[PDB]
Amino acid sequence: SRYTTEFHELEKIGSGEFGSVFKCVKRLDGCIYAIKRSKKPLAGSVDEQNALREVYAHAVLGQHSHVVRYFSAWAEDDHMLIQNEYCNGGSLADAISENYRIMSYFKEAELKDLLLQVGRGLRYIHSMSLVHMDIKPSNIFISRTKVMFKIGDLGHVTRISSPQVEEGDSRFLANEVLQENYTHLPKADIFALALTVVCAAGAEPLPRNGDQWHEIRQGRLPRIPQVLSQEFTELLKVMIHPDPERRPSAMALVKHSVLLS
Numbered sequence: 001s002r003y004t005t006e007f008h009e010l011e012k013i014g015s016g017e018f019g020s021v022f023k024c025v026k027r028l029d030g031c032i033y034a035i036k037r038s039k040k041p042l043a044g045s046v047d048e049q050n051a052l053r054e055v056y057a058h059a060v061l062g063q064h065s066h067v068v069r070y071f072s073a074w075a076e077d078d079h080m081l082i083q084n085e086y087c088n089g090g091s092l093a094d095a096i097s098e099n100y101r102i103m104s105y106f107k108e109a110e111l112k113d114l115l116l117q118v119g120r121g122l123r124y125i126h127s128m129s130l131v132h133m134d135i136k137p138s139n140i141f142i143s144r145t146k147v148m149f150k151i152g153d154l155g156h157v158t159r160i161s162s163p164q165v166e167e168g169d170s171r172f173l174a175n176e177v178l179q180e181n182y183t184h185l186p187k188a189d190i191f192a193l194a195l196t197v198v199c200a201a202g203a204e205p206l207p208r209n210g211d212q213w214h215e216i217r218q219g220r221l222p223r224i225p226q227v228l229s230q231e232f233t234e235l236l237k238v239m240i241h242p243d244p245e246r247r248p249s250a251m252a253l254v255k256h257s258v259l260l261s
């Protein structure tokens, strides 16, 4: 196969219903890549159009330092393979879990660094008239050696002015998207990013539904166990404002005083 011929598989680094991700060395350049290998989705299914959204997003998206670089995608032997940039820091989700294990944490400065960098990624995507629609720790990836946060997993990417919306994780989902209101989709990414940072700040696991789910959608910031400045807190707070029009845009976010620099 092209997979075996072009690459040497080093180790499986991720698995799940989405398939599996392998750390691979490309024989030609000797560089490390992350390759997702999954069953070729059923024609007409959500998994197909999910994969369609991923591959067709890079047709629009160029290279950006806060978006995981895409190299190629192909199908063979009833399997689909996507070759991406390898981020040696793994996902933000794993980093959060590792913090919990060894009792470390992200300092307030590091949290603002995370917000700004992913903010820069969102600004570019939005400027291409696209929206990510699934921003969460597991979809944020880390490159080190000196720390670069990159947006990955474009399986939910869709147009701004042509809304075809497949909802993302309910834990990060803005209420207006649930209400089938797609007039301000960029602000949905902003909403999810705030909760993503709140996750990195060491907050308890976000609710999938129920009471405290609604309280968050009311604009209530989840309890954070560490001391953040009231100014950073208020920024995160407005990012989850019930009115998406009061939430800052991505380009307004990256220009914000508390974040710079």
Ligand SMILES: COc1cc2c(Nc3cc(Cl)c(OC)c(Cl)c3)c(C#N)cnc2cc1OCCCN1CCN(C)CC1
Pocket (backbone or CB within 6 Å): 013, 014, 021, 034, 035, 036, 054, 068, 082, 083, 084, 085, 086, 087, 088, 089, 090, 091, 141, 152, 153, 154
């Ligand atoms: C979770 O594992 C990793 C997934 C990564 C990843 N996912 C991904 C998602 C999707 Cl949806 C894709 O399909 C479009 C494709 Cl192709 C890849 C991208 C991307 N993109 C980039 N970088 C990653 C890096 C990872 O681990 C890095 C170090 C792990 N190391 C630590 C020491 N030890 C325990 C051995 C394992």
